């Protein structure tokens, strides 16, 4: 969800 | 000192779009993710979405994705907000503010640039 | 979305005085990779841009006073101002940035004198 999307934006 | 320098106030008529921009000075534009928050009263704060400036791609709220448009300019260290089919709901101010990664608050804030929607 | 809820939504105070306000956040802000809570308090004072205070719910920014504490766990979280000073008139967001990022409503604080 949007949490992981946040994750792979800001690796 | 870091700033981010945002334009000015405008008026839009409903069902245009509008482009405000947030130039940053102080520091290196692509070293930071950049952020924008709407502001619609003293008491209400609500994010559209984040830049990644090294890259150019973006992640956008559900609630604003396909409205708004984040995009870069490197060269001349500016960011870009574009916000379409607006509503008069969509009269508020908006601010670019800076993270430095996923873990960081958003340590540095634009003065905000104030869309007024109407005809 | 994870709603984020502040208490009181104002209050004033004589200056030296200690002022607490809470905010509470719909589920867990907790993030697993580095056990941080991702929680963040801003004062926002008239006219100004918000200016960040505190991150991972209790790690002062650097630059703000020692006065200003952030503290709590799991979804109850506080902002803390040991000794108020007239300057510190402001209203206080709180953030959330596990997920998709959201805001509490505020608390304004007043001065008396």
């Known amino acids: 969800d949007f949490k992981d999307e946040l994750e792979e934006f800001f690796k | 000192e870091v700033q981010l320098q945002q334009s000015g106030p405008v008026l839009v008529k409903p069902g245009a779009s509008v482009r405000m921009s947030c130039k940053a000075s102080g520091y290196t534009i692509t070293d930071y993710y950049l952020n924008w928050v709407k502001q619609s009263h003293g008491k209400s704060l609500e994010w559209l979405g984040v830049?990644?400036?090294?890259?150019?791609?973006?992640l956008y709220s559900q609630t604003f994705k396909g409205k708004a448009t984040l995009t870069v300019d490197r060269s001349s260290s500016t960011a870009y907000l574009e916000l379409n089919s607006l509503t008069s709901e969509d009269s508020a101010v908006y601010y670019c503010a800076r993270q430095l990664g996923r873990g960081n608050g958003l340590d540095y804030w634009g003065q905000g640039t104030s869309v007024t929607v109407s005809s | 979305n994870i709603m984020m809820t502040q208490s009181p939504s104002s209050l004033a105070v004589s200056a030296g005085e200690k002022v607490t306000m809470s905010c509470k956040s719909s589920?867990?802000?907790?993030?697993?990779?580095?056990?941080?809570?991702?929680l963040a308090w801003y004062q926002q004072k008239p006219g100004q841009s918000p200016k960040l205070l505190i991150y991972?719910?209790?790690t002062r920014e650097s630059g703000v006073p020692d006065r200003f504490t952030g503290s709590g766990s799991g979804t109850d979280f506080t902002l803390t101002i040991s000794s108020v000073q007239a300057e510190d008139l402001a209203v206080y967001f709180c953030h959330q940035y596990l997920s998709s990022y959201t805001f509490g409503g505020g608390t304004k604080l007043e001065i008396k004198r």
């Open positions: 991972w719910a209790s």
């Open positions: 589920q867990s802000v907790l993030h697993s990779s580095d056990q941080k809570n991702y």
């Open positions: 830049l990644n400036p090294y890259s150019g791609g973006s």
